[PDB]
Amino acid sequence: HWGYGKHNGPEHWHKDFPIAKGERQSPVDIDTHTAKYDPSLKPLSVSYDQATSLRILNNGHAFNVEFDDSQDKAVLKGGPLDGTYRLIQFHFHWGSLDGQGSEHTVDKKKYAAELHLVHWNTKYGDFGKAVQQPDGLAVLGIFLKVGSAKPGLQKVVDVLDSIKTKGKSADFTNFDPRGLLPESLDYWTYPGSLTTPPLLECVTWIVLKEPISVSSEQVLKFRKLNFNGEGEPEELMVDNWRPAQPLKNRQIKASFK
Numbered sequence: 001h002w003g004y005g006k007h008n009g010p011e012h013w014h015k016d017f018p019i020a021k022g023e024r025q026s027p028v029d030i031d032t033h034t035a036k037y038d039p040s041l042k043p044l045s046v047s048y049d050q051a052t053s054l055r056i057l058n059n060g061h062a063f064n065v066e067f068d069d070s071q072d073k074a075v076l077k078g079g080p081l082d083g084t085y086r087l088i089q090f091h092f093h094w095g096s097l098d099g100q101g102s103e104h105t106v107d108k109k110k111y112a113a114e115l116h117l118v119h120w121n122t123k124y125g126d127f128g129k130a131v132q133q134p135d136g137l138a139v140l141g142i143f144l145k146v147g148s149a150k151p152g153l154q155k156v157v158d159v160l161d162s163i164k165t166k167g168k169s170a171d172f173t174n175f176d177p178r179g180l181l182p183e184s185l186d187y188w189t190y191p192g193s194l195t196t197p198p199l200l201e202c203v204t205w206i207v208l209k210e211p212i213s214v215s216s217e218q219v220l221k222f223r224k225l226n227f228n229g230e231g232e233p234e235e236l237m238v239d240n241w242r243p244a245q246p247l248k249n250r251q252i253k254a255s256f257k
């Protein structure tokens with residue numbers, strides 16, 4: 001099936017998912033000089049005080065921290081968005097070395113990792129219906145650089161030993177995703193897609209300008225995870241990122257000057 005290897009990686013995905021070569025694919029390089037400041041963009045509204053995390057899952061491609069999205073608890077609004085988007089999960093993409101890992105790039109710079117907080121538009125009633133709509137999802141992307149530790153990430157890091165392999169999950173309640181945010185909510189935004197199969201063109205991307213810092217030890221623990229299931233030959237879960245795709249007929253807008 002699809003993955004991140006030589007034989008099943010991003011360059012192969014178009015055979016099962018022809019939208020891979022579509023008109024609004026993600027990620028993209030963010031050329032900072034070409035992104036236009038848009039004074040009509042609003043501040044982003046991140047309301048995560050009532051977030052209810054439930055579980056952490058190794059899905060064979062990344063690990064997902066899952067939230068209760070059965071009511072408006074943790075929501076994203078404002079910014080480029082119309083209406084209300086509910087947090088369903090977060091996950092990361094990362095590298096085998098600190099010089100690569102992010103999906104978005106900034107003037108061709110790759111960060112060590114990238115956090116994605118996935119939200120769906122409540123006007124469509126459920127996630128599955130939302131992914132069929134061009135404005136169905138809003139994904140908040142946050143770059144990770146290696147430096148000082150991120151205290152709010154350590155609870156995530158410490159549970160990873162319990163979900164080493166594909167299909168393992170663990171209870172993961174009372175995690176506060178506010179502890180993964182940078183100080184500034186300045187952002188770039190553009191219309192795009194999921195970065196994994198099925199690659200659906202249903203996402204408004206919101207990529208924060210300010211990276212968070214995590215420690216070398218924190219990201220090292222991400223790279224001890226496995227793509228494989230229990231008892232199968234060990235394939236370290238590293239380099240689970242799709243490279244930048246053609247921008248085509250899109251404009252990246254900045255919320256800041």
Ligand SMILES: CC#CCNS(=O)(=O)c1cc(S(N)(=O)=O)ccc1C(=O)O
Binds near residue numbers: 196
């Ligand atoms: C049908 C369908 C779908 C997409 N699911 S997701 O939005 O949770 C998601 C989103 C993304 S990303 N990188 O596009 O935000 C990656 C991975 C996943 C996932 O299934 O775990």
Ligand SMILES: [Zn+2]
Binds near residue numbers: 092195
């Ligand atoms: Zn992602």
